[PDB]
């Protein structure tokens, strides 16, 4: 499906000088055209992969024991298996084999929030700190297997607390620092962890994050769990419960700073993350390591002795995967950010830049595009020449933004690599090689190695041959880092990535093919209501009410409203194997609501919940009509008329 | 009287040409290398080219009958749930695992790698949920249904220890397994069939778990379907539990000397067997007793609660990537042709059956077997008790059509694999006879009053074993000086079957039954 | 910091001809000189020594799977590491791959309390034992990292015990036998063990030790503990409680005599080992294991016939090291010996030795005391030419002692090996080689393998270059064998061991190198003075003062002096029943100097005779000599005692 050849110019960025080599810079490790890509790519997929796969797992990784079979599953049973036979570790391959190589060598450039706090944390400290920790775990009772929880903000003991699981075999569940006591109650309860990790309290931006008073909120309602270790990130006063909680730092004093690796089967989980009932993306070991040490080296170019800045979260699989997993297991330097991109001023990224010479820096639109809004004079007078690649995640980026990003904070003289994944891929699976590829703006360009990816039209299930045609993203094959699960609950697993559409993975992200053969990701524009100062998205409620088991669709608005600015009205049809003869239609209306209530807060609760026989439809739903009819606008197939009398 | 292998066992018709052959010769060069005095290279050989082992073993073997501290390939490691699916299915995805023959004849289907290989998975995936360790004992009341081999490979696969309890017996009968071996965990069936008779599975199961403290999960699978008392919290159904796991589980790296199985012989007997040397001499007997193939198709009609279907229902067909075939029907149900009806359905290549069986379809008569095809089979087996010569005649004339190699085959649930049998390509046969020993065997007749051992033929004793074998049993669970007492004290020096036997003038051995 | 060379004698006793490989002994590992023993020990130090340490490693174990590093971490934050990717077992080594090349081979020369009752436990019979406890706690419950007490007596059994749980692995936690109820619960409780494994009765000497007695006492206060396997030792009734408490014999009938190996990471926990709050030693498996494998094999010139009698407990590191781990490391044949060195008579030892024709010997200088006490006839006419080494160790050796050792035990042809070491080093640290190093009387000589060490002086807190200083003993880089941790008391250790000196270990021993180099612990002690030319022993004036009746004991000690090159300074202490009131201290002190002169010579008589109420002593009764030279040399200001003021009333008779 990926074209031969890309030609021509013009609205193609070509890798710019420090992506050929020249200046002093390290010679790319794939280039220098789209073919060069394309020669190395087919060798991933397709009918002669294993022998390419086998080999970068033997060069990439540390294993204690070698594998005999590459790869075998599938999408259709969920039965994923890579290097099945062989046995290794995470904390190993991320901090052993390094410390003892180069013990000195900064693991991470640790940003703290306050500039002045910042400094290099080596891999003799961070493998130290691993083991303390780990040992900790071990004295709780912690075994192979066993989920452990971590709520942790941006410091750098965070990629202690997740090699720490990984040293001895358990497996991590990690949770966003700031959600609220509701959502990691309910993760916490979900992976049935007996162990959670976390903080006194966060630092961000020069605002207290109240971890602590979180955890204690959300415990009552966590009966499993029974160890808490509490970093004194702050040292304030916090509440602290005698016999569950003890001091991250005091537990670690008597332990000893070196702790075994457990030997884990490839296919032994390494962790659990829950995307924002909630879904356990479960990831394997090996593939999974691989699939973000491959990313990492080809994707950004990383070289021995780069300095690479993802300036993401822990709590997302982006700093899962390219944080702490695919910087630490090539060994280079990583940056964990604890503050935001504009405190204590709009220069901080590049501040950040110029003082560690920054080699890579990986961010999302939505920071690129509040730097530009800042100003020129926050970023014109650095240098950032330290850099060659610039990398995008998590939405699509937008021609400005784009060119800001280029002009500004590349100079004209780095690769820009918008890079398209999901938590159930493990690593990059759509992006530009910046030594190869000319970019195109707001493109992901072409699958990385491993991703064999298509475009399906979404109404006949095809496959669509050529290009200028959309449809939605599938991928042909599995790829090593593929979610292998979801945690206890395979059915949803297989239901929602490999039922959709047989013999492929359905991503759930529609997609564009344009002339030259580079890939268009789309995105989601579920409109915002604001209900007494909320901003609530009319997907939230839609995906709200359908919890619901009976109800088949629904499609909610918002009209205006005298009390609360906006209010939210909900249009509901049921199942047909539902027979709603023992409820009248009112205790349906204050069931759904007070279910809406439950999920997504005391204010969402539709205002009006209109049971109606069917949606109106084209082929989507009319939800321009449904606000008409809401706001008194019936004077401005059949159904509508149906809709109209529940309204008036 | 002497019966030499047929046409289908000399490589003629289009058959595979057997392993070991044409004659007595060829038995007895390829068994002189594995007793004795420098049989360890033969042994070293072949466990490395049957098994897949993750570590290499370097001692052959130590140990002996004096203290029961037998060792087979010590220091190696592997699964015999890898060697059982994983490596078959890495290889055949499609290649048919098990033959499931229901009760029902029209409800019987193949069963692939593939699928048993993810259904085995899914089921360890349960068992870890529900804490289960390597080392734990895991009671298995199940009948002759194919899931039967995915419960007890699940157990292989984290290194759990399965009991596999008959479907059938007692409660109390189920009780005292249950106890004895201390297992949390009971993998059981709603409801079982055989010869259109239903067996009460879980009502036995409820009645039992009554006097059981120990059991705190127990999992149900629904064979039929039909209503069956289930206490909330302790029982879950097999399909909702398998739904919410992975298809893959990861193996458990074994030491060769890690417990593989209890079985309790019908105070309670659990004999015990270890991994590797279990493994080994399944496989290898399988493979030359029967003359197994890449592609045969082997179908033994026993039951997976004796050693029977341990051994050459599941572990050995299994080991050697074969189809095997899982009989959940009576040999006379629907009609006294289900055996003969069964064949020609599937072409199967081997069939093994009891005299207790041959006698059964003999007394029904010659019309339900006469008319079928039969071509298929190149061997027919007897094991469990003397064949008379006349069932030995009847099963050579009608069953195989004096076409296939018969081979009385002789052992015990302590001896892990056959023992005594002819091999089939190279042994000629005397009806009633259980002619030579296996490879590995080293067996004799002692004088019981004397406890000498009578040189020469034409004697008439007991039958002694020299020298231990891969797959003899390890001990008795948790009862190790009975393990002692039954088998290395009456002889010392020696292991003691407990069978009388005579070696007529040309070295035949004759199985006498009990003392 | 070591010598290239150490020349001279008449004070150097070179390896004697059973250590020169002559009289049909084994040639030794190291030697014949000491240049021999430098150019290995640098190997083992310094910039190669990853590669002789490698080969080392895979020389002497077995492993399951090999490691990849070396070595890593260090002293600052206690993250030591040796060969951290390998795999093994400690009974694997010790039990099993001996057994399967000579499984008839004497394992354990048990001697019995009765001398009777002694007999050899093989190999195969240990292994058997080994497995069948092992299996006995598998079904107990017992997992990999699980502590389990130990508290029994010197039977051999107590090596299946440890081996047991190395097996499975389990961290064993031995308990001197013989430690009260309160020394034992505060151990059981303080590595939360749920399995205690103990003795019916012990016994040593005649006398019974009441172990299940203490044992019960002791678990009333123990609310971790579940089982409590006891063996037969003497079959007396004794209490036992129904469930907790089950029969040995019992419980093992039951189980297989095999049981696989647990494969066990280099750096998993091996052992806990409290010492006399407790302080839990830990040691690893695979560095703990090498260590006493190779200083075993060296430090006694083990060879694979020998047959090594050390009389020590297994509830010390010493049995630990010397009795179980090293010796069966290296499958030779080891002895427990369950008795005194007096009983029956003083005479045991070197009835034993001839018994089993014992080719080592390891004891301690307070074993050495008591028989010199008993008289020569004890041991003058035995054979004993079956020893080639004599090994002492647990506390400095005076020379009146050493050379008893050396007369009697060893004839005169056997090597005397003085070994300094602690629980925290796992294995010896400094000690003679016995083929290649020339003795001196109490000293210690030259560092181990991969020992480096060094006098620092305690006042500038900076490292004493060259001979002929003292200071306080450090190490400068870690070796295979040391603990890595304290019992969840990680700080304890970093602050009793890497804190005071950053970048050292600190021993907390005071230490000398004299100017040929040889390292003295706690100090530099007298064998022969030279007054005026002559030649003068310190037995032989103090034989000379114990001449006047009256005189209760004596310690003459040496210094330079400007006039006759060395003067004899002597302390001497009356008898009870004297009442010295009749003559004037300064009387006593001309009569006694003149005694010496009538009876060795007019050059023997002492410069100073101080007559002191008592001589300081230890509580384990060695006279401390070399606090006593330290003080006449004008170092009581820099300087185990039972009474400090004995100290300070020296001082003041000196100053
Ligand atoms: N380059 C991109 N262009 C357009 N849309 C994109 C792009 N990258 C991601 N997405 C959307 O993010 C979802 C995945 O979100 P998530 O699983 O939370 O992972 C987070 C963390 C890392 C990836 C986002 C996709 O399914 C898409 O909807
Ligand atoms: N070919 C044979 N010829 C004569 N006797 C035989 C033969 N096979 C078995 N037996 C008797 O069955 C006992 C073993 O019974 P069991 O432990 O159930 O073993 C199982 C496995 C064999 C089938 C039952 C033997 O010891 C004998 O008594
Ligand atoms: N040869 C020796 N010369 C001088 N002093 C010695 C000597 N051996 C020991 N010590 C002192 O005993 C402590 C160690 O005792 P310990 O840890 O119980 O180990 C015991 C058990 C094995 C080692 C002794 C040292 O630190 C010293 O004080
Ligand atoms: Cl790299
Ligand atoms: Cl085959
Ligand atoms: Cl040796």
């Known amino acids: 499906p990926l074209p031969d050849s890309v030609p021509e110019s013009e609205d193609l960025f070509a890798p710019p000088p420090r992506m050929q080599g020249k200046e002093g810079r390290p010679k790319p490790h794939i280039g220098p055209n789209y073919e060069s890509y394309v020669k190395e790519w087919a060798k991933t997929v397709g009918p002669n992969s294993?022998?390419?796969?086998?080999?970068?797992?033997?060069?990439?990784?540390?294993?204690?024991?070698?594998?005999?079979?590459?790869?075998?599953?599938?999408?259709?049973?969920?039965?994923?298996?890579?290097?099945?036979?062989?046995?290794?570790?995470?904390?190993?391959?991320?901090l052993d084999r390094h410390y003892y190589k180069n013990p000195k060598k900064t693991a991470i450039i640790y940003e703290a929030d306050e500039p002045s706090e910042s400094r290099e944390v080596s891999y003799e400290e961070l493998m130290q700190e691993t083991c303390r920790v780990a040992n900790?775990?071990?004295?709780?009772?912690?075994?192979?297997?066993?989920?452990?929880?971590?709520?942790?903000?941006?410091?750098?003991?965070?990629?202690?607390?997740?090699?720490?699981?990984?040293?001895?075999?358990?497996?991590?569940?990690?949770?966003?620092?700031?959600?609220?006591?509701?959502?990691?109650?309910?993760?916490?309860?979900?992976?049935?962890?007996?162990?959670?990790?976390?903080?006194?309290?966060?630092?961000?931006?020069?605002?207290?994050?109240?971890?602590?008073?979180?955890?204690?909120?959300?415990?009552?309602?966590?009966?499993?769990?029974?160890?808490?270790?509490?970093?004194?990130?702050?040292?304030?006063?916090?509440?602290?419960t005698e016999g569950r909680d003890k001091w991250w730092d005091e537990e670690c004093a008597k332990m000893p700073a070196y702790c075994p690796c457990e030997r884990m089967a490839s296919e032994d989980p390494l962790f659990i993350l829950y995307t924002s009932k909630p879904k356990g993306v479960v990831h394997s070991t090996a593939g999974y390591l691989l699939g973000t040490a491959l990313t990492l080296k080809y994707v950004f170019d990383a070289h021995p002795?780069?300095?690479?800045?993802?300036?993401?979260?822990?709590?997302?699989?982006?700093?899962?995967?390219?944080?702490?997993?695919?910087?630490?297991?090539?060994?280079?330097?990583?940056?964990?950010?604890?503050?935001?991109?504009?405190?204590?001023?709009?220069?901080?990224?590049?501040?950040?830049?110029?003082?560690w010479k920054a080699t890579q820096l990986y961010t999302a639109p939505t920071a690129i595009r509040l730097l530009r809004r800042m100003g020129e004079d926050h970023v014109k007078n650095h240098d950032l020449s330290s850099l060659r690649v610039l990398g995008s995640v998590g939405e699509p980026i937008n021609p400005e933004?784009?060119?800001?990003?280029?002009?500004?904070?590349?100079?004209?003289?780095?690769?820009?690599?918008?890079?398209?994944?999901?938590?159930?891929?493990?690593?990059?699976?759509?992006?530009?090689?910046?030594?190869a590829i000319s970019t195109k703006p707001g493109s992901a360009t072409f699958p990385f190695f491993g991703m064999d990816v298509d475009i399906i039209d979404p109404q006949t299930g095809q496959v669509l041959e050529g290009?200028?045609?959309?449809?939605?993203?599938?991928?042909?094959?599995?790829?090593?880092?593929?979610?292998?699960?979801?945690?206890?609950?395979?059915?949803?697993?297989?239901?929602?990535?490999?039922?959709?559409?047989?013999?492929?993975?359905?991503?759930?992200?529609?997609?564009?093919?344009?002339?030259?053969?580079?890939?268009?990701?789309?995105?989601?524009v579920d409109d915002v209501i604001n209900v007494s100062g909320h901003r609530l998205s009319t997907a939230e409620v839609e995906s709200a009410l359908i919890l619901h088991k009976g109800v088949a669709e629904t499609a909610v608005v918002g009209c205006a409203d005298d009390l609360t600015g906006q209010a939210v009205y909900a249009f509901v049809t049921m199942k047909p194997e539902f027979d709603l003869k023992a409820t009248k239609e009112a205790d349906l209306s204050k069931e759904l609501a007070i279910?809406?209530?439950?999920?997504?807060?005391?204010?969402?609760?539709?205002?009006?919940?209109?049971?109606?026989?069917?949606?109106?439809?084209?082929?989507?739903?009319?939800?321009?009509?449904?606000?008409?009819?809401?706001?008194?606008?019936?004077?401005?197939?059949?159904?509508?008329?149906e809709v109209k009398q529940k309204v008036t």
């Not at 204690?64 to 099945?84: C, I, L, M, N, S």
């Not at 997504?600 to 321009?624: C, E, H, N, Q, W």
């Open 401 to 435: 933004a784009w060119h800001w990003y280029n002009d500004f904070a590349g100079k004209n003289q780095c690769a820009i690599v918008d890079t398209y994944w999901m938590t159930e891929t493990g690593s990059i699976s759509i992006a530009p090689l910046p030594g």
């Open 50 to 94: 294993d022998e390419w796969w086998a080999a970068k797992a033997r060069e990439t990784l540390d294993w204690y024991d070698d594998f005999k079979t590459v790869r075998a599953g599938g999408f259709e049973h969920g039965d994923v298996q890579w290097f099945p036979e062989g046995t290794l570790n995470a904390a190993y391959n991320c």
């Open 467 to 524: 290009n200028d045609v959309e449809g939605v993203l599938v991928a042909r094959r599995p790829w090593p880092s593929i979610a292998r699960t979801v945690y206890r609950d395979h059915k949803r697993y297989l239901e929602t990535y490999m039922k959709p559409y047989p013999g492929y993975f359905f991503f759930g992200d529609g997609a564009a093919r344009d002339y030259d053969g580079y890939m268009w990701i789309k995105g989601r």
């Open 595 to 641: 279910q809406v209530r439950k999920v997504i807060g005391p204010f969402a609760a539709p205002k009006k919940i209109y049971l109606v026989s069917d949606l109106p439809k084209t082929r989507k739903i009319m939800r321009r009509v449904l606000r008409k009819i809401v706001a008194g606008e019936g004077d401005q197939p059949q159904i509508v008329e």
């Open 136 to 240: 900790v775990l071990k004295s709780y009772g912690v075994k192979k297997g066993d989920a452990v929880s971590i709520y942790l903000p941006m410091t750098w003991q965070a990629a202690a607390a997740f090699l720490a699981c990984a040293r001895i075999g358990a497996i991590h569940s990690a949770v966003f620092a700031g959600f609220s006591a509701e959502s990691l109650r309910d993760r916490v309860n979900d992976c049935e962890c007996k162990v959670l990790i976390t903080t006194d309290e966060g630092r961000r931006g020069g605002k207290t994050i109240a971890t602590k008073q979180i955890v204690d909120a959300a415990l009552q309602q966590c009966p499993l769990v029974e160890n808490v270790l509490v970093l004194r990130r702050t040292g304030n006063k916090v509440p602290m």
């Open 305 to 355: 002795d780069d300095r690479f800045a993802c300036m993401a979260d822990i709590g997302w699989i982006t700093g899962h995967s390219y944080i702490i997993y695919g910087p630490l297991a090539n060994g280079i330097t990583t940056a964990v950010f604890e503050s935001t991109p504009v405190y204590p001023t709009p220069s901080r990224y590049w501040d950040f830049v110029d003082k």
